[PDB]
Amino acid sequence: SGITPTLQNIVATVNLDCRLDLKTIALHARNAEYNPKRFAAVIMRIREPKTTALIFASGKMVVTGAKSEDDSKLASRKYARIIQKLGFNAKFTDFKIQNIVGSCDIKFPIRLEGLASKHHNFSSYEPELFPGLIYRMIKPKIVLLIFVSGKIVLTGAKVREEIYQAFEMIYPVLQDFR
């Protein structure tokens, strides 16, 4: 049922073996920015699988901006290769997906107050703080941001199948509301 949602952003996490002398990464590589008094990590960027990679001093890495699982893996491998090129003893030891963010445009607008007031146990509405309704599923553990304009963006999925499941489970619900 319904029309499938797209993906917009996949966040993936990698643990590098070695401690990083993080300032030297900013000093040596142009595609990198480091401001410890604002944020604690060096935000590398790479062009071909267009992504940004937060590289923390502990060796953790968070890669963002890819739109496919294999694309995110490839980008993270390239970032590990870059950190190995700067001279650190960096290894692609681990890789986990942590959030796949889906998005879709449903044609009809949403009677948002109906969803806010009929469903109780998993719905919350905050009109001025954030214009969308916050829907918190239980079985797939996906949070859906539902907007009056019919925009729905899904987050917290570990794999795309959960995104599709959540959308086809919420579609026959909000179909009852305009």
Partner: protein, 1623 residues
């Protein structure tokens, strides 16, 4: 500013490459025409080498290059580092690595530039590491332009600066220095370090020493620099790449012997025979390799001479290709390419070993992500182009077959599918280079295997460039195989005919139900960890459907190509494989088969060969299409699910009797081998249309009323899903029919009833969302029109041409619909202009895209004779315009219900869409249409004007020589016309769209455009003002670099003279110092000072071009004489002209001078002093006298008028035409609504001119009322000025504003400042007056009195709390209470007697307390300022001893008459009868004030003069005084400062002391420095951890800017570009 400063500024900020190129070219010309300006230019351009932006830095480097190339070379005969000493080991072991250096150390930046250079020069020797230990910055404590200048090389200072800047910690500055040295050395190196007097022999030694010293530093940077960019697949090291270029630059001139020292050092850096065995190898080796690249590139002449150098460079290359690091391998592969044809001559052994190693570097696979293989394969492709290399392959084969060429080439196949796109593209290009060789070399490997590999690389590749290169490679391979024998090609591709045909015709599917390709069909490159597997699975969701369609059409192209060459008896397998697909149950298979047949017919030599397919193709368009497609089974299954849900809703909540309703079939039509009983959309229609109402009949009462409000929504869900399924099926039918019709058109069949062909093709053009299919269909119809016209079957041809013309006009966003806008009149349409809105907009965009491509291909196909071969298009785009605009508009053209208006609009749209592609032989037709379009531009209806404006924008955009002459001759001169608004509106719309479309091509014509645009920023119509200001803001920017543009080639002679007539005007307007001198004709009775003469030149300039401005000269510079002389000269000139010509516009008329009341006498006195021959009438006095003067005003040269008299007697002052109308003290009209301003703005006048001391108090936004008086609407009406400028600026002042609001405010205020600046004339006093002695502004402090303390504490303890809590409120009344309290407080501060009137809160207690003191309220002990004033009067000798030199004469200022009377009574009479004083305040009539000022000024008997600031404060010259005492102060600092400055001015001859009497406490503290020295000149989540709604995106708050474009590296470091710049 001047022209030069703005032209240099263009380099930083510019639209495009073209504008910056023009700026640098014009800088070069400006240097050529004025050679001595060389260093004045370089000192302006050099500081941009340090700029933060790459493009600005590169453009500044180019500007230096071009400027230097025009400077003369240096040859006077017409501590340096030694290169031999460079010990590479120490420089890398010790020394400072150069990186993106740390934060700025401001203590060093503060140094004077020369001492800064000296200190950095001291630190340089340490940082290079020559000390034998790592230098630490602590050892060196930190604590006419540097680039400025025949005894020595002129650029010696600049190079001394740049050579030390070359080691700066910042990476930007190192880049800048490297490029600056690159250009300066490239042009002038041969003269470097020469000096005068020394012999040529000795100057050669000095030049050698200097260039060795430079190359030393360049090598040091090559080995020390480690900064790199890892954004792309191959790391780029921008600084050492630039330094490689600079080393190439010095290498051109450096002596032949020193090239060997450079070569030895680079060779040492590459081999690293003695350096530590560490990771340090990488940077040093890469630097050495780029150095060797430029050594071999720029000095070919050295390699041929002796073998050791060529042997060592090839040793370095061979070592590098075997290196572990991929970047070393890449740069080594790149190093040999420039020298291949030089190297092939070398000894056989070196060539054999190089071929061996370059081939063996492909034998092993590299790292998965290593992109370096691309460069190695480029090296291999270049090597294999030379016959000596191929002969070496033959020699190798003769002793080892395994290294033969035909058996080595398969080593490239595993890299076709490489993970890095650059590697795939490099492989395909290398294989293409191998194919184009002698057939004997390549006939061994061109076989079925490589054909299959390339074909499967045509299907699975997503990247566009790899796709196109693979298809070109396939074309060359298959064509070259065919050229040997078609039977050979057939034999090779026989075994792969069927698998690749299956892969070519495979279906596509839908997002979550893909149809995967069989992996067994894909053959491995080796003959049998990121895998490009998404495309093989047909995963439509991960790879967009457009990509899959593109792969299918490209596979169809390749298969159609190869089918052409095989002889037709052998095509049987291909024929059956495609004929079985034309009837395939999948829509996509039928489409792909149709495209395969299309391409085969297309690139086959003759359609008669392909004719056998004709009946299978024609049956597709003739016969009824199948009702289902297996590709679409998802839609019908969704229909089934929804209909079942509706039935369930009936069963559960309708509670209908079960079993009297249809059980829907489980299997859906289109499923594999589903029987005829399967569910179908026809059954869904039967359900929702008939069965639904049948169940409504069946449902009982009591259930209907509750069941229906759900059943209705369920029915609408089901019916919309059914319509969606039907729409998808219809779309597939249209697509397949269009593909079939295109295939038929390719076979040149023309049925006797072509309506099915035409309908299918048009339906595809009108509907196809996918761009590729739509373009294919457009090319089809474009060919079909030609087929019909050549056959003579004109009927269908004209029908399709008319239909295409109709489609081209459908985008309402571009072509207006006439019936809606037909009534609109005098609206500038360019400003004003459900989901069905967006859906219809999208469909209109699709259909217009299709029809526009169809008409473009029609134009390109028919060429010069299109208008002859296709008459109906001529009719379309010529008949409506000649009907409508040959004469006046026929009245039917206005009727919305008559199509003729839409015919006119469509004609203009057709001209707009055709003329940018129309063949140049048809431009005389468009120019023949221009006279009608320019008449439609003057039309009354808004929509015709809008369309005509866009049409002339495009016509002039593509016919510049002929269109622009018509526009300038017959549109622009009408723009001044006041009689008819349509003319001006049309012209301004043309200029708007013309500026929009032409971009930078307008540069020759901006002088024609600018002056008639500037003239219209003050137009009466509001929309004209909006567009005129918008155009001017983006058109003045191009003026500074106009003057050097060569004349437009075809432009008429008269227009060039017109250009030259006003190029001078705009050049004077932007930079007033260029203004021509104006010889004042009349005999002014006093000689003007220098700056006065220049200001009069400015005023005469404004008078000559009918601009109006503000003579904002600082107080006391003598604005009166400037104004009087310009007014007198204008009267003289216009009287002369009226006698000469009788023109009414120059007839004699009186001028008006409006001033505050007290200056009415002053102006008459100044006139009688300087211009006695002008009659002046003082329209001032009681109303009876003004009534007596009522009619006399016309008969005098100048009328003087007070502001209040102007307000009250506006009813008579307004009735006369006033010529000049000078507002003396114009800042009193700052209020936009105050009555005197509402009065003054009503006066008619030819020229207007404000005089002020200070134009603003706090903010530039106060200027609005003045410019609304001078030039009505120049800054817009009040709301437009407020929301455009004022509200953004005000909002941006607070910390509340976001950074976007802050930068918007800065941009807005800069826009206003640039808009208003040319009209203000501001020159400060101290800049131009040197005889005038200085002034000093002291304070004088007196303690508060007892009563003042008592009343302050009382006011604060009783009412202070309420006021301070009211400060927490923001309404008018609250801040009114604050203002009242402050104003009340000040009156108390001056003296208690002012406030302590009867009935005051403190009155009775004050009386009894005064009784306790035993003195009256008026005792001056309770008023301290009176007690202070006596001190300053006495110590200045005023009133002392009641020689008589009298060293001081004073003014004393008060804000109010009570304070002045108190001072005049107590201090001046009760205490000091010895003082003699004069009165000046409101008690004396305005006619007496001039006399009393004259009495004080001429007669030294009187000691002091008493002034009310409101009365005496402004302009009234009182030069005789030499000290001023401010006993009471205004809030506004400008009135306070002006009260001082009316004492200190021209003619004053003593040092002036200004005393402010200040009480120690209270509000006096808040007014101390104001007047002293201020002149007023969506998807959003937290990435690190999932949460809804972040308020702050911490790690990305900067926005990271944006990722820089790789074109910066690609176009800048190109070696072929570098060598091009030698000469």
């Amino acid at each position: 500013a001047t022209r030069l400063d703005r032209l240099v500024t263009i380099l930083e900020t510019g639209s495009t490459r073209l504008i910056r190129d023009t700026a640098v070219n014009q800088l070069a010309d400006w240097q050529k025409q004025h050679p001595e300006e060389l260093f004045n230019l370089l000192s302006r351009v050099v500081p941009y080498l340090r700029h933060k932006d790459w493009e600005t830095r590169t453009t500044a480097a180019k500007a230096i290059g071009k400027i230097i190339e025009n400077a003369p070379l240096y040859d006077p005969n017409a501590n340096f580092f030694r290169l031999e000493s460079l010990d590479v080991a120490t420089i890398v072991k010790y020394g400072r690595p150069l990186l993106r250096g740390g934060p700025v150390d401001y203590n060093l930046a503060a140094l004077d530039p020369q001492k800064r250079l000296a200190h950095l020069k001291k630190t340089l020797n340490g940082r290079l590491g020559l000390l034998g230990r790592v230098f630490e910055d602590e050892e060196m404590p930190v604590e006419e332009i540097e680039a400025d200048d025949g005894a020595e090389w002129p650029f010696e200072r600049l190079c001394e600066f740049l050579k030390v800047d070359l080691f700066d910690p910042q990476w930007e500055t190192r880049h800048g220095a490297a490029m600056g040295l690159r250009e300066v050395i490239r042009v002038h190196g041969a003269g470097a370090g020469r000096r005068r007097g020394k012999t040529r022999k000795e100057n050669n030694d000095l030049n050698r020493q200097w260039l060795d010293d430079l190359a030393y530093r360049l090598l040091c940077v090559l080995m020390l620099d480690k900064f790199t960019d890892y954004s792309s697949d191959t790391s780029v090291a921008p600084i050492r790449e630039t330094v490689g270029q600079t080393l190439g630059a010095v290498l051109r001139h450096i002596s032949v012997e020193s090239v060997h020292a450079i070569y030895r050092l680079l060779y040492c850096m590459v081999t690293q025979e003695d350096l530590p065995s560490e990771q340090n190898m990488w940077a040093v080796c890469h630097g050495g390799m780029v150095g060797l690249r430029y050594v071999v590139a720029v000095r070919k002449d050295l390699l041929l001479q002796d073998g050791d150098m060529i042997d060592g460079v090839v040793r370095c290359v061979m070592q590098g290709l075997g290196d572990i690091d991929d970047d070393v391998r890449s740069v080594s592969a790149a190093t040999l390419i420039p020298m291949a044809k030089e190297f092939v001559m070398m000894r056989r052994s070196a060539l054999d070993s190089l071929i061996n190693i370059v081939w063996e570097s492909l034998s092993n696979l590299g790292d998965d992500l290593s992109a370096s293989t691309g460069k190695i394969m480029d090296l291999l492709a270049t090597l294999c182009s030379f016959p000596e290399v191929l002969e070496a392959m033959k020699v190798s084969a003769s002793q080892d077959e395994e290294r033969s060429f035909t058996l080595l080439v398969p080593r490239l196949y595993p890299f076709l599918r490489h993970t890095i796109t650059s590697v795939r593209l490099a492989v395909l290009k290398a294989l293409m280079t191998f194919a184009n060789l002698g057939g004997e070399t390549s006939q061994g490997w061109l076989n079925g295997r490589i054909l299959r590999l390339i074909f499967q690389n045509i299907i699975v590749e997503r990247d566009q460039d790899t796709l196109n290169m693979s298809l070109e490679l396939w074309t060359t391979l298959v064509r070259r195989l065919a050229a040997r024998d078609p039977a050979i090609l057939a034999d090779e591709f026989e075994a792969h005919a069927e698998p690749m045909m299956q892969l070519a015709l495979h279906p596509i599917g839908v997002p979550r139900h893909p149809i995967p390709m069989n992996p067994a069909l894909f053959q491995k490159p080796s003959g049998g960890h990121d895998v490009d597997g998404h495309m093989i699975q047909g995963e439509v969701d991960l790879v967009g459907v457009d990509v899959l369609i593109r792969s299918r059409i490209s596979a169809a192209k390749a298969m159609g190509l190869i089918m052409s060459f095989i002889p037709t008896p052998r095509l049987a397998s291909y024929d059956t494989a495609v004929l079985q697909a034309l009837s395939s149950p999948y829509a996509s298979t039928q489409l792909a088969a149709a495209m395969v047949i299309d391409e085969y017919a297309k690139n086959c030599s003759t359609p008669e060969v392909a004719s056998r397919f004709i009946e299978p193709l024609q049956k597709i368009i003739d016969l009824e299409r199948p009702s289902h497609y297996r590709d679409l089974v998802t839609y019908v299954q969704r229909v089934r699910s929804a209909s079942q849900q509706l039935i369930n809703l009936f069963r559960d909540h309708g509670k209908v009797s079960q079993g009297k309703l249809p059980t829907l079939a489980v299997v859906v039509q289109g499923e594999p081998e589903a029987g005829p009983g399967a569910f179908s959309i026809a059954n869904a229609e039967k359900v929702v249309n008939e069965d639904f109402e049948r169940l409504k009949r069946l449902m009982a009462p009591g259930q209907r009323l509750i069941a229906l409000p759900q059943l209705n929504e369920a029915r609408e869900q089901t019916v919309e899903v059914i319509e969606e399924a039907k729409a998808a099926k219809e779309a597939r039918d249209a697509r397949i029919k269009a593909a079939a019709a295109c295939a038929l058109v390719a076979m040149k069949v023309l049925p006797k009833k072509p309506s099915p062909l035409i309908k299918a093709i048009m339906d595809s053009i009108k509907t196809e969302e996918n761009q590729e299919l739509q373009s294919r269909s457009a090319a089809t119809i474009a060919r079909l029109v030609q087929l019909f016209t050549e056959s003579g079957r004109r009927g269908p041809a004209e029908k399709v041409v008319a239909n295409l013309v109709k489609f081209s006009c459908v985008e309402v966003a571009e072509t207006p619909e006439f019936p809606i806008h037909a009534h609109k009149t005098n609206v500038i349409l360019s400003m004003q202009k459900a989901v069905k809105y967006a859906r219809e907009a999208k469909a209109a965009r699709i259909t217009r895209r299709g029809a526009k491509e169809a008409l473009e291909i029609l134009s390109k196909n028919f060429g010069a004779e299109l208008l002859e071969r296709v008459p109906t298009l001529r009719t379309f785009m010529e008949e409506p315009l000649v009907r409508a605009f040959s004469g006046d508009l026929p009245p039917e053209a206005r009727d919305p219900e008559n199509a003729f208006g839409q015919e006119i609009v469509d004609a203009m749209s057709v001209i707009r869409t055709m003329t940018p592609t129309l063949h140049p032989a048809l431009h005389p037709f468009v120019m023949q249409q221009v006279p009608l379009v320019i008449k439609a531009l003057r039309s009354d209806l808004s929509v015709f004007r809008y369309m005509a404006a866009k049409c002339m924008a495009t016509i002039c955009s593509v016919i510049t020589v002929d269109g622009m002459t018509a526009l300038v001759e017959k549109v622009l001169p009408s723009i001044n016309n006041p009689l008819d608004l349509s003319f001006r509106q049309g012209a301004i719309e043309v200029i708007y769209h013309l500026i929009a479309v032409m971009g930078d091509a307008i540069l020759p014509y901006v002088i024609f455009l600018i002056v008639p645009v500037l003239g219209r920023m003050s137009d009466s119509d509001n929309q004209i003002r909006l567009i005129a200001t918008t155009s001017f803001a983006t058109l003045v920017k191009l003026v500074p670099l106009e003057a050097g543009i060569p004349d437009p080639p075809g432009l008429s002679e008269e227009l060039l003279k017109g250009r030259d007539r006003e190029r001078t005007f705009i050049a004077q307007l932007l930079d007033p110092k260029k203004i021509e001198p104006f010889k004042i004709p009349v005999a002014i009775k006093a000689e003007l000072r220098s700056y006065q003469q220049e200001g009069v030149n400015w005023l005469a300039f404004l008078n000559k071009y009918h601009l109006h401005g503000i003579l904002c000269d600082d107080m006391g510079l003598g604005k009166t004489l400037q104004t009087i002389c310009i007014v007198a000269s204008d009267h003289h000139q216009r009287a002369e002209e009226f006698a000469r010509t009788g023109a009414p516009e120059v007839r004699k008329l009186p001028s008006l001078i409006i001033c505050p009341p007290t200056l009415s006498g002053h102006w008459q006195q100044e006139i009688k002093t300087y211009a006695p021959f002008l009659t002046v009438t003082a329209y001032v006095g009681s109303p009876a006298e003004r009534r007596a003067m009522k009619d006399s005003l016309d008969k005098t040269d100048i009328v003087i008028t007070s502001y209040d008299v102007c307000r009250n007697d506006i009813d008579v002052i307004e009735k006369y035409n006033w010529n000049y109308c000078v507002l003396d003290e114009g800042h009193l009209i700052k209020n936009p609504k105050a009555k005197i301003t509402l009065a003054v703005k009503r006066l008619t006048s030819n020229h207007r001119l404000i005089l002020t001391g200070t134009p603003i108090q706090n903010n530039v936004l106060e200027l609005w009322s003045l410019f609304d008086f001078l030039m009505p609407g120049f800054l817009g009406a009040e709301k437009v000025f407020l929301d455009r400028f004022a509200k953004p600026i005000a909002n941006s002042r607070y910390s509340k504003a976001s950074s976007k609001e802050q930068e918007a405010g800065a941009l807005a205020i800069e826009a206003l400042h640039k808009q208003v600046l040319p009209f203000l004339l501001r020159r400060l006093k101290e800049e131009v007056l040197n005889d005038l002695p200085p002034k000093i502004l002291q304070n004088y402090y007196c303690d508060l009195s007892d009563l003042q303390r008592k009343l302050f504490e009382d006011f604060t303890k009783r009412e202070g709390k309420k006021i301070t809590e009211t400060a927490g409120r923001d309404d008018k009344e609250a801040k009114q209470h604050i203002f009242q309290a402050l104003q009340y407080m000040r009156k108390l501060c001056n003296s208690p007697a002012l406030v302590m009137k009867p009935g005051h809160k403190a009155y009775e207690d004050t009386q009894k307390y005064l009784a306790k003191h035993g003195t009256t309220l008026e005792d001056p002990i309770h008023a301290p300022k009176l007690g202070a004033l006596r001190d300053l009067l006495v110590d200045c000798g005023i009133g002392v001893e009641g020689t008589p030199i009298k060293p001081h004469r004073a003014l004393i200022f008060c804000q109010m008459k009570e304070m002045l009377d108190m001072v005049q009574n107590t201090v001046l009479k009760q205490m000091l009868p010895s003082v003699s004083y004069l009165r000046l305040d409101g008690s004396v009539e305005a006619n007496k004030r001039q006399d009393i000022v004259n009495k004080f000024n001429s007669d030294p008997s009187y000691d002091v003069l008493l002034l009310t600031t409101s009365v005496g404060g402004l302009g009234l010259n009182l030069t005789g005084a030499d000290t001023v005492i401010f006993v009471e102060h205004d809030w506004n600092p400008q009135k306070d400062l002006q009260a001082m400055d009316r004492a200190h001015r021209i003619g004053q001859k003593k040092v002036v002391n200004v005393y402010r009497i200040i009480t120690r406490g209270t509000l006096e503290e808040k007014i101390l420095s104001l007047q002293r020295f201020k002149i007023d000149v969506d998807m959003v989540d937290i990435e690190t951890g999932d949460v809804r709604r972040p308020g702050k995106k911490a790690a990305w708050l900067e926005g990271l800017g944006e990722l820089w474009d790789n074109a910066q590296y690609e176009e800048s470091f190109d070696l072929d570009g570098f060598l091009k710049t030698m000469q």
